[PDB]
Design a protein around this ligand. Structure first.
Ligand SMILES: COC(=O)[C@H](Cc1ccco1)c1ccncc1
Length: 130
């Protein structure tokens, strides 16, 4: 229905706004663009599904997310990729891990405050009907 297409349009507006707020935070610059395959050729041998905030913006506009749950699976993948690629005790690895945890925690805290639980349940029930 037109009403259901208005629901998904409001979801995309919400997700673009959350993503922009994460992408401008200086702590998260390391998560804004793909890891460059020239500078780091080893990356794509270890990390089998790369993800970053520019790719998330492109996915919103391709209508890849019908629920906030499917958006948060890609925020969780950004964070888990950084934890698995940089697991060591040295300061460089510990700094990215702390930033990855802060990107995940910050996204979940904006959603807990600003997403209405009945708006998410509506998106889930339209998705489950298709
Ligand atoms: C999302 O970025 C990463 O996982 C890279 C891994 C990387 C790049 C070069 C060598 O290793 C990283 C970038 C900056 N600081 C720590 C790690």
């Amino acid at each position: 229905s037109m009403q259901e297409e208005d629901t998904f349009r409001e979801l995309r507006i919400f997700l673009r706004n959350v993503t922009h707020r994460l992408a401008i935070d200086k702590r998260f610059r390391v998560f804004t663009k793909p890891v460059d395959p020239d500078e780091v050729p080893d990356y794509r041998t270890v990390i089998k599904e790369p993800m970053d905030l520019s790719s998330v913006i492109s996915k919103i506009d391709l209508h890849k997310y019908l629920t906030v749950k499917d958006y948060l699976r890609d925020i969780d993948l950004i964070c888990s990729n950084a934890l698995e690629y940089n697991p060591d005790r040295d300061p460089g690895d510990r700094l990215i891990r702390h930033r990855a945890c802060a990107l995940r925690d910050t996204a979940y805290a904006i959603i807990k405050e600003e997403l209405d639980e009945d708006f998410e349940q509506l998106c889930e029930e339209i998705q489950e009907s298709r």
